[PDB]
Chains A and B, each alone.
Chain A
Amino acid sequence: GPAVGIDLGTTYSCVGVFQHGKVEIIANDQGNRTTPSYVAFTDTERLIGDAAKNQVAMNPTNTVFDAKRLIGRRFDDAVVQSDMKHWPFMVVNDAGRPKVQVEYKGETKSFYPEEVSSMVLTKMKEIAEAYLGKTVTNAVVTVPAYFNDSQRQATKDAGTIAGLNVLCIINEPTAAAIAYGLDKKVGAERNVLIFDLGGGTFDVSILTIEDGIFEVKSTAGDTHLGGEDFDNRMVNHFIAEFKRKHKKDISENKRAVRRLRTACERAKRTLSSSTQASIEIDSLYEGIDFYTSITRARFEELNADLFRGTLDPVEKALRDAKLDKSQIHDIVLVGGSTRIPKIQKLLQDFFNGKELNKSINPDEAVAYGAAVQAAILSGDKSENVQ
């Protein structure tokens, strides 16, 4: 029975398996090849993934996400203290350790970040088991290149709690490089830039690769810039719209705002392949149906600063690596947000028209690499050579 690769992402998770000579990125039972990193605790049940995210508006205080921001940290950590203001769920201090606190089956319960992440991993394991028709125990699990030993060990512990044996914890940008087979090349060292714009975080990594050996030369980015922020730019746009049309402000109604955000995220995805998108929400606020349209142009304008701003970390990573932009052998798009046409144009223009590696779905690339690596470490991907 094969080992699997799991991208345990801040906002979404993804599982792949190398079998019969090919990597399969595995669809969940709702048909989605990525699964929200969400966990909801209700009166009757514990919900994970699509079902958890889908009911966030009805149950905000007991639906946990962002556990990856807590994992491997102390409660007193400046990052934890700052992040806590953004979350509708409770975070408490247990002898120096952060714990999320929820209401569940009529009881107050708390969970360590690695426990929350174990529930996400458990779901990913089950997604793989459905597809393979057998139990999954071994996995490679990925993490950000900048994760420290504490964050890595906590990620491994999450696997153990999910009944997995973690064969290795590897870096996200390195997983993406492996998916493209970039570590199969021989000869002179080659420089690889990974441009990774996700749902919550933006990571630029420069790797040097020689004879299958990796070196992370530099890292740059913004841990608080992602697709969620593009969604919010749309949300504000439509709150204004609704207020002008109906003489009503939905801003202080949390349920309405979240339902609008859901619709905006869906429209955004549509705008990556079409030039316009329609939104339809039944009874958004005080009985009023909300219907509207938005163009790709208007979306891009609403986010113009945030998009062009992604180039600054590119510049920063380049100088820290002591490389000129012309010294980059490969550019790899990773993360759901890099499907945005304007982003791709912006980055390619920066690199003077140079071709971008994007043939592997950017939101699946990390899982894809993890899957390859898991097979290698299991003895299930021998080379032999002709």
Chain B
Amino acid sequence: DPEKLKILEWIEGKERNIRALLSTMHTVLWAGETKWKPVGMADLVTPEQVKKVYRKAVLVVHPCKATGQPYEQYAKMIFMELNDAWSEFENQ
């Protein structure tokens, strides 16, 4: 579907760059999502800044919360990519 396609393109676009993902996550969130404030790259410079924003994002797209909601499939796709991006970031 279109919302799925948008996420697939986003994921492929950022190449697992956690900063690129977090700074553009507002563009892939479902309509109805009201918690997430778009984050600029200036708020994503230090590892401590990336960790803080990462933790906020996972809370928004958490599968437990999303269970039974119309956007469940999309929360899951975003959650799993964020986790992969974070573990790669941690590897550095």
Question: B-contacting residues of A (Cβ < 8 Å)?
Answer: 167-168, 170, 211-214, 376-377, 379, 382-384
Contacts and interface: CB of A to CB of B under 8 A. Distances in A.
Contacts of A384: 84
A347 B84 CA distance: 43
Contacts, number: 24
A376 B72 contact: no
B73 A167 contact: no
A183 B76 CA distance: 13
B84 A377 contact: no
A167 B79 CA distance: 14
Interface string B70-92: 00110010001001101100000
Nearest to A384: B84
B63 A382 contact: no
B64 interface: yes
A213 B73 contact: yes
B87 A379 contact: yes
B64 A379 contact: no
Interface residues of B, number: 12
Contacts of A379: 83, 86-87
A384 B16 CA distance: 12
Closest 3 interchain pairs by CB? A168-B64, A379-B83, A382-B84
Nearest to B84: A382
Contacts of A214: 67
B1 to A, nearest CB: 11
A377 B59 CA distance: 11
A167 B64 contact: yes
Contacts of B84: 382, 384
Contacts of A211: 73
B86 A377 contact: no
Nearest to B81: A382
16 contacts: A167-B64, A168-B63, A168-B64, A168-B67, A170-B67, A212-B73, A212-B76, A213-B72, A213-B73, A214-B67, A376-B63, A377-B62, A377-B64, A379-B83, A379-B87, A382-B80
A377 B72 CA distance: 14
Contact of B83 (A170, A213, A382): A382
A170 B63 CA distance: 11
A384 B80 CA distance: 10
A220 B2 CA distance: 38
A377 B58 CA distance: 10
Given A377-B63, A382-B83, 11 more contacts: A168-B63, A170-B67, A376-B63, A377-B62, A377-B64, A379-B83, A379-B86, A379-B87, A382-B80, A382-B87, A384-B84
Contacts of A167: 64
A338 B76 CA distance: 34
A167 B67 CA distance: 13
Contacts of B83: 379, 382
A44 B76 CA distance: 49
Contacts of B76: 212
A128 to B, nearest CB: 20
A288 B38 CA distance: 79
Give the interface centre of A168, A170, A379, A384 by most chain B CB atoms within 10 Å. Answer: A379
